[PDB]
Design an enzyme around this catalytic site. Structure first.
Site, short mmCIF file in Angstrom:
data_model
loop_
_atom_site.label_atom_id
_atom_site.label_comp_id
_atom_site.label_asym_id
_atom_site.label_seq_id
_atom_site.Cartn_x
_atom_site.Cartn_y
_atom_site.Cartn_z
CG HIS B 54 12.02 -57.40 44.16
ND1 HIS B 54 12.12 -55.44 44.29
CD2 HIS B 54 11.22 -57.90 44.67
CE1 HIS B 54 11.21 -55.09 45.39
NE2 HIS B 54 11.04 -56.50 45.10
CB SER B 123 8.60 -52.80 45.29
OG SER B 123 9.16 -53.19 46.19
CB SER B 125 15.10 -52.32 45.15
OG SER B 125 15.75 -51.28 43.85
CG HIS B 130 15.57 -52.66 40.94
ND1 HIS B 130 16.51 -53.97 41.58
CD2 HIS B 130 14.32 -52.75 42.13
CE1 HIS B 130 15.70 -54.79 42.21
NE2 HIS B 130 14.71 -54.22 42.18
NE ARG B 138 8.80 -56.08 52.16
CZ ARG B 138 9.92 -55.54 51.82
NH1 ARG B 138 10.67 -55.97 50.25
NH2 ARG B 138 10.74 -55.38 53.17
NE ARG B 139 8.53 -48.13 50.36
CZ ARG B 139 10.02 -49.11 50.25
NH1 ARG B 139 9.93 -50.16 51.56
NH2 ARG B 139 10.68 -49.58 49.53
#
Ligand SMILES: *[C@@](O)(C(=O)N[C@H](CC)c1ccccc1)[C@H](C)NC(=O)[C@H](CC(=O)N(C)C)NC(=O)[C@@H](NC(=O)[C@@H](NC(=O)CCCCCN)C(C)(C)C)C(C)(C)C
Lengths: 220, 220
Positions: B54, B123, B125, B130, B138-139
């Site tokens: 991120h 990941s 966002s 993005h 986390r997923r």
């Protein structure tokens, strides 16, 4: 920058190289009290990163065979390494989170605590003791590494240590040998992400030597 | 020389940016079928960026394509940053893990392998700001896969089908966006060391996707 100078000041690290009351995960890791004392009696040890002889950051200031095991106090000094460490800490959300309650922020210290939480000792079976290495987790148990600016203070981070103990140690502590770069440290960082049972093991070590982390910069 | 230019060639990556058959053990996020479909289909479509964890100053490339499929969202991004890749390639030369190389008949590819061990996860966002390469997601079912040929990577994931590959393929067919540096990635490095149960998690997405029952560059 003043600050950028306080940071890059030497940093001590302390902990056990081996805990007598602990049976190694492997035969090779066997290092009994009898051997230690005989060795120490005979055989300044280098302080590197992950045993890489091209990443020496300081030296070993003290070695002592206390009651529960062998204990050493190392001193990080390499300005080259410390600078990088200072640079990386500036970009670590962990460091940024600060330490516990009454402790004051020391990014370079915290970052090393999070980075090389364990102590690994290079040995043989002149000088059986080759060197001590800062690593993400020792292979022996109870090898939690404790970082601080005051050597006296890092020693006081271990209950098992007695006033007599610190006496013999204090009566020991009282150029830039580094050779790698951040890229190197980076490559070593991935190897660290695949060591099984790491955090669990780190936690087991804390409890084993009493470092609550509510009294030190330990991150596990 | 020569190979260093070969390693600093673009790298592909893909995986589920979400698993429909999965319930976030932490609500917050939420990926429900009809959502994405309704969301992807919108507004050609503007370039989605790819960054390390991120960090909008650590752009490495862009997502090359995304598609709604049988078990969740799946995207194939493209890592291009000559600066990012250069670092990763010097870091790779200094990694024991990478040093050991791939499995069975897979040929070595340090840069791919390094990324493989560093950013095992994907990941997510316009709602989709993005996609980010990170040490984990986390997923669950976010396991990232690096390869030099997109078709090849898609080929790593069983759930996919010729049909699905059709759409994806139909999709992927300026300057150096990266702004961070090695210290930056180093800094993010320890933060990763503190994500609880990373491997056990990671291993999970391996079977949850079937990449275990195949051969790849995944180091988990
Ligand atoms: C230490 O905790 C450690 O290695 N931690 C690392 C951190 C990344 C780790 C590894 C795996 C998983 C998690 C963490 C650990 C206690 N120390 C060692 O393993 C240590 C490593 C080392 O010194 N090097 C890699 C150089 N190993 C030793 O100290 C061993 N020493 C030797 O093998 C010595 N050998 C000899 O004296 C005779 C060799 C005969 C060869 C044939 N002629 C020597 C010279 C290699 C130092 C042991 C004492 C453990 C045997």
């Amino acid at each position: 920058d003043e600050q950028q100078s306080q940071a890059v000041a030497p940093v001590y690290v302390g902990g056990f190289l081996a805990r007598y009351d602990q049976s190694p995960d492997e035969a090779e890791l066997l290092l009994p009290r009898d051997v230690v004392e005989h060795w120490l009696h005979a055989q300044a040890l280098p302080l590197n990163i992950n045993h890489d002889d091209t990443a020496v950051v300081g030296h070993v200031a003290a070695m002592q065979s206390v009651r529960d095991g062998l204990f050493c106090l190392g001193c990080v000094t390499s300005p080259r390494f410390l600078e990088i460490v200072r640079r990386a800490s500036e970009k670590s959300e962990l460091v940024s989170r600060g330490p516990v309650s009454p402790l004051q922020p020391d990014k370079v210290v915290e970052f090393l605590s999070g980075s090389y939480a364990g102590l690994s000792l290079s040995s043989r079976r002149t000088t059986p003791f080759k060197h001590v290495a800062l690593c993400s987790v020792g292979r022996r148990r109870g090898t939690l590494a404790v970082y601080g600016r005051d050597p006296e203070w890092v020693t006081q981070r271990f209950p098992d240590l007695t006033a007599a103990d610190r006496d013999g140690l204090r009566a020991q502590w009282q150029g830039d040998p580094f050779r790698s770069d951040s890229y190197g440290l980076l490559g070593n960082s991935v190897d660290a992400l695949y060591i099984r049972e790491r955090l669990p093991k780190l936690r087991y070590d804390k409890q084993l030597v009493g470092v609550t982390e509510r009294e030190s910069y330990v991150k596990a």
